[PDB]
């Protein structure tokens, strides 16, 4: 039956040939367990590729392109099989086809190819996929097609090692600046995941995202209705504030901190964790940045989470409270103890996580030194807590850095 399909796919009779290619396509398209290996093994790929040249029969270009889309959606080995067959140049040709359904199906097939990894990505780029792919972005295009275009845009941004060439990023960013203004959720989500990926690849890429003009349009989406956009926006903006004080100030000057009360009280544990993670990277900043977090009424809300959050959120809140005791002035830390930090800040000394107890201690070590006169006054708030007796254990910890600190604090 497969043997018949392949013979027939090369037929000089148009009906016989179209029915065969459509039958090859329906094997690949009609369950979620398609026989890709058998199709490849049967000699179909060259005929499907050759059908891509048949500008005279666009029904056949479409059906061949759909078959190849689904073969190239499998294992890297199956994707390699398509690419090995000289399919990419012919897909790129079909991006200039007058039949929309043929353009879209070519865009889809190149998405599966770009999605295989960075060599296939950099090959499709090197042949000029990005101009023609972005030029489909227009209001006139149907939504289902534009979603397939934004999904390919995510696939171009997806790999860090190596990331796409600087010049490709420079072509894609202007398209994301347009797409970030859309209302369709799947498109907004795809656009913000592209930005997550582009800002997850170190300070040069981050500067390109800033230079693009897009940050004032990204930060408002921290307050979008759909959690799925919020999760992506918070990631992308969190990636940017792992850069310089100056790169951070760009996010702060977009009024980012206005959106945090909703994130620090969000019902999803993960949105809380990433919000405190983000704020941990603002309090590791200069004293104006530390002050901005104070002025936005966020320190009390970071403490609630220090106390009553999942282990994950607490860890992040430890850091945000700790990072502050380092970067800040003695008035800024004064504000802290006035906000009942020491209780929920000492209740974490007894966790199996070395790094958390380590950063909790430093914070108490650093807070007492910078609270000069009122050093005793702090101790009587550590008694009531009953974290004095959890400091003892530390002194028995395997890890040197922790026990020293315990003794080093005992003295004073």
């Amino acid at each position: 039956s497969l043997e018949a399909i392949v013979q027939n796919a090369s037929s000089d009779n148009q009906g016989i040939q179209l029915s065969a290619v459509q039958a090859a396509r329906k094997l690949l398209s009609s369950d979620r367990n398609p026989p890709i290996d058998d199709l490849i093994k049967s000699g179909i790929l060259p005929i499907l590729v050759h059908c891509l040249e048949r500008d005279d029969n666009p029904s056949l270009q479409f059906e061949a392109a759909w078959a190849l889309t689904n073969i190239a959606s499998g294992t890297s080995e199956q994707t390699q099989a398509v690419v090995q067959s000289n399919a990419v140049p012919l897909f790129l040709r079909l991006l200039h086809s007058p039949h929309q359904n043929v353009c879209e199906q070519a865009v889809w097939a190149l998405g599966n190819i770009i999605g295989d990894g960075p060599q296939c990505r950099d090959y499709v780029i090197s042949l000029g996929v990005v101009k023609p792919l972005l030029s489909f972005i227009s209001p006139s295009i149907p939504i289902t097609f534009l979603r397939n275009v934004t999904w390919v845009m995510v696939n171009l941004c997806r790999h860090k090692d190596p990331p796409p060439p600087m010049e490709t990023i420079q072509e894609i960013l202007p398209a994301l600046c347009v797409l970030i203004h859309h209302t369709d959720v799947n498109i907004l989500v795809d656009t913000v995941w592209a930005l997550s990926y582009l800002t997850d690849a170190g300070n040069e890429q981050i500067q390109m995202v800033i230079d693009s003009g897009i940050v004032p349009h990204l930060v408002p989406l921290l307050s979008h209705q759909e959690v799925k956009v919020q999760t992506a926006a918070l990631r992308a903006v969190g990636n940017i504030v792992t850069g310089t004080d100056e790169q951070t100030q760009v996010v702060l000057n977009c009024d980012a901190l206005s959106h945090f009360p909703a994130l620090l009280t969000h019902p999803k544990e993960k949105i809380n964790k990433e919000a405190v993670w983000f704020l941990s990277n603002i309090t590791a900043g200069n004293q104006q940045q530390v002050q901005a977090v104070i002025d936005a009424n966020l320190v009390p809300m970071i403490i609630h989470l220090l106390d009553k959050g999942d282990f994950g959120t607490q860890k992040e809140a430890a850091w945000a409270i700790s990072n502050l005791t380092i970067s800040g002035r003695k008035d800024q830390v004064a504000y802290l103890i006035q906000q009942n930090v020491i209780p929920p800040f000492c209740n974490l000394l007894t966790v199996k996580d070395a790094q958390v107890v380590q950063v909790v201690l430093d914070g108490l070590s650093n807070i007492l030194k910078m609270a000069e006169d009122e050093a005793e006054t702090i101790g009587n708030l550590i008694e009531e807590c009953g974290g004095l007796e959890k400091i003892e254990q530390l002194q028995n910890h395997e890890n040197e850095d922790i026990y020293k600190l315990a003794y080093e604090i005992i003295d004073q």
């Binding site: 398209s29 009609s30 369950d31 689904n70 959606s73 998405g111 599966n112 999605g115 997806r158």
Partner: peptide, 6 residues
């Protein structure tokens, strides 16, 4: 990252 059309 890859999507079959079905």
């Amino acid at each position: 990252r890859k999507r079959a059309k079905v």
